[PDB]
């Protein structure tokens, strides 16, 4: 019955595609994490310019709201999607709820790392909500990975 | 139709289109960093003005650029021509930024040097023309990667 299944594979991939776009947006916050207190050098490495991180986290925030806006535009995965959409709302929330240390002239490095740097030894100002958001997008990626693998398996199962 | 062999055309096409959508999302994230140029996080959630402190924001954009290049390096018959065209575009984006360190790599990178690097509609290039071009290669690599997947699905007839 290749008629039905043709659609089913498109639909499932469409979701997996949408999910990876959000998993990649989030990974860009991990690259932003490598940029706290850094400028560009001629050789292409990163050199230190300490404790000016206001617009770095501003863009980190900007991305974290794109993530929510992307999740919203998403069968069967309702629970794992809404659980992820709630996670990204509490990442934006915790960032915006910390302006007094993330929203000033000369945002320091220390409180910058506390917001977008995973495994930061000192999670206080948003990282925990980001780590929890990374795990939440894994369970959803795997769910939509398996969801599409199931529609391909329908091809061959007698 | 060779039903087991038609899959693993779909699977492999899927995998590439995924990894291709990955680098688009990283591209699209740079546009989010272009909205942050000379901005700060406010209480109500909006972006309030804080000009001329932009060094770290462009270092963030720069690392995304070398992740884009690395991703395209880990990436295919009809795409080998389009993969290398995209990868090459992403290295001239990473090279126009470092070649401009004195403007984009100093304490107090001004709002207007940043809008010539990652902002697409500026009046241009510190990096933007290589960005707009990189975004061009990817959009045609994605078209190719999409057509590869549609051709595999099509083989089921």
């Amino acid at each position: 019955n290749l008629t039905e299944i043709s659609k089913k594979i498109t639909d499932s991939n469409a979701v997996l595609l949408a999910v990876k776009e959000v998993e990649a947006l989030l990974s860009s916050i991990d690259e932003l994490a490598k940029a706290i207190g850094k400028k560009i050098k001629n050789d292409g490495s990163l050199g230190d310019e300490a404790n000016h991180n206001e617009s770095l986290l501003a863009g980190a925030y900007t991305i974290s709201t794109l993530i929510t806006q992307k999740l919203s535009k998403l069968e069967g995965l309702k629970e794992k999607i809404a659980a992820a959409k709630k996670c990204s709302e509490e990442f934006s929330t915790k960032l915006k709820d910390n302006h007094a240390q993330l929203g000033i002239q000369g945002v320091t490095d220390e409180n910058a790392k506390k917001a977008i740097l995973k495994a930061n030894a000192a999670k206080d100002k948003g990282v925990e909500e980001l780590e929890k958001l990374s795990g939440s997008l894994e369970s959803l990626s795997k769910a939509a990975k398996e969801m599409l693998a199931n529609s391909v398996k329908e091809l061959t199962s007698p | 139709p060779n039903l087991t062999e038609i899959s693993k055309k779909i699977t492999d096409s899927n995998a590439v289109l995924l990894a291709v959508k990955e680098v688009e999302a990283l591209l699209s994230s740079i546009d989010e960093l272009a909205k942050a140029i000379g901005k700060k996080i406010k209480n109500d959630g909006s972006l309030g003005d804080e000009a001329n402190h932009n060094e770290s924001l462009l270092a963030g954009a720069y690392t995304i650029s070398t992740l884009i290049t690395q991703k395209l390096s880990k990436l295919s018959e009809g795409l080998k021509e389009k993969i290398a065209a995209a990868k090459k575009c992403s290295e001239e984006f990473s090279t126009k930024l470092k070649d401009n360190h004195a403007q984009l790599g100093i304490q107090g990178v001004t709002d207007e040097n940043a809008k010539k690097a990652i902002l697409k509609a500026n009046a241009k290039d510190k990096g933007v023309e290589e960005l707009e071009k990189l975004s061009g290669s990817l959009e045609s690599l994605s078209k190719a990667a999409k057509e590869m997947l549609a051709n595999s699905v099509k083989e089921l007839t």
């Epitope: 769910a143 990975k145 599409l148 199931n150 391909v152 | 087991t4 693993k8 995998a15």
Partner: antibody, heavy 123, light 107 residues
């Protein structure tokens, strides 16, 4: 931290129904993966019995399709296997297993097994 | 079925020797094949999936390769802890047929 454990009567009388249960720590059969039963008669090779996905879909080995049932206790994080009208040819070490896509996208590969329980059929 | 024919049923080898086990599928199954090592009275361990991909943990000395139809498992060098029965599996469709096994004795 995935673990699988089989349990049930290691002795079944001919023409009876064979019952086993798999208990899963470290994972949730409700959240995903495929879960299956495999059987190996002593000194012999491996035979697959059936599989299920939390979505409801259930598939069985056509050589056993007449005499097999698999059930899910989502509340107990457990699934069972029901082989009816058994003979001595069904004397085997029985495994529950988990299927996973691993590094790829299709198909699923068996990556976690139980320790295996031996059920001898005899009167 | 789309049966699977594992070519050597039994095998003797010495520590350091090279060993090759073969798997013939009667139809093409792409690369949807897996190799398991099973030591006596234990569940099968998984070595290789997608017919060349090495599962984590497994030593690099193991390796696989195969076309749509014919597959081989190679262990480069050898060690007395590779005494086991080895199995094909075909995962493209059910009933996920296992091979018939290959007993491997060390000399």
């Amino acid at each position: 931290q995935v673990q699988l454990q089989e349990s049930g009567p290691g002795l079944v009388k001919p023409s009876g129904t064979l019952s086993l249960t798999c208990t899963v720590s470290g994972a949730s059969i409700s959240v995903g993966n495929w879960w299956s039963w495999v059987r190996q008669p002593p000194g012999k090779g491996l035979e697959w019995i059936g599989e299920f996905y939390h979505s409801g879909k259930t598939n069985y080995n056509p050589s056993l399709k007449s005499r097999v049932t698999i059930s899910v206790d989502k509340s107990k994080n457990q699934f069972s296997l029901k082989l009816s009208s058994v003979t001595a040819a069904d004397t085997a070490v029985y495994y529950c297993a988990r299927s996973d896509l691993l590094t790829g996208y299709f198909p699923y590969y068996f990556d976690y097994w139980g320790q295996g329980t031996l059920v001898t059929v005899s009167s | 079925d789309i049966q699977l024919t594992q070519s050597p049923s039994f095998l003797s080898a010495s520590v350091g020797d090279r060993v090759t086990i073969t798997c013939r599928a009667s139809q093409g199954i792409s690369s949807y094949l897996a190799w398991y090592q099973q030591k006596p009275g234990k569940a099968p361990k998984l070595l290789i999936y997608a017919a060349s991909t090495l599962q984590s943990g497994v030593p690099s000395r193991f390796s696989g390769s195969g076309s749509g139809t014919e597959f081989t498992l190679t262990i480069s060098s050898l060690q007395p802890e590779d005494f086991a029965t080895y199995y094909c599996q075909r995962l493209n469709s059910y009933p996920y047929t296992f091979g018939q096994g290959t007993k491997l004795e060390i000399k």
